[PDB]
């Protein structure tokens, strides 16, 4: 098992910030998924992690991160045998700044609507990683992504 983390990331609209791996990323390159994900260092904690990911792929500063799927956990694998099995907990934060893309770990990104997103990842789960898909189909997590649509002044 390892240990790792998922963010969804929205702006003060409540646009969701949608994401396209690199071609040249290990495991599920250019695959569209959610935010950010990655794997948190020996003694930082998850939330930590979530804010140094974010500036190392996006540039990107962040409120504080919400736990929105703690106990998620999943063994799936990529199109050439890869496998991953990690206890993976689920956040969603707002941006507070500009995004400025890192080239070697994002291709292509999208600012969305959720409720587009959702219909997306229902009708056609194959074109997305299989980890935003089952993030966005747990109804608790589900329900913590819809709270981040609201509008923030």
């Keep these: 098992l390892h240990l790792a983390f998922s963010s969804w990331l929205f702006n003060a609209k409540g646009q969701l910030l949608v994401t ?6 290990k495991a599920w390159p250019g695959v569209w ?5 990655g794997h948190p260092q020996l003694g930082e904690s998850n939330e930590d992690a979530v804010i140094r990911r974010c500036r190392y792929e996006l540039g990107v500063e962040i409120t504080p991160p919400e736990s929105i ?3 998620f956990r999943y063994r799936a ?3 050439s045998g890869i496998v991953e099995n990690e206890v993976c907990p689920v956040f969603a934060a707002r941006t507070t700044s500009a995004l400025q893309i890192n080239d070697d770990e994002v291709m292509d990104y999208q600012w969305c609507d959720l409720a587009d997103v959702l219909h997306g990842i229902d009708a056609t789960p194959w074109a997305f990683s299989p980890w935003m ?7 608790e997590a589900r329900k913590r992504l819809s709270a981040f649509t609201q509008l923030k002044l």
Excluded at 20 to 25: M, P, T, V
Excluded at 133 to 139: G, S
């Design 69 to 71: 799927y703690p106990d």
């Design 20 to 25: 396209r791996r690199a071609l040249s990323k």
């Design 133 to 139: 898909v089952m993030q966005a189909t747990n109804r």
């Design 77 to 79: 694998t990529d199109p």
């Design 33 to 37: 998924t959610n935010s950010v994900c």
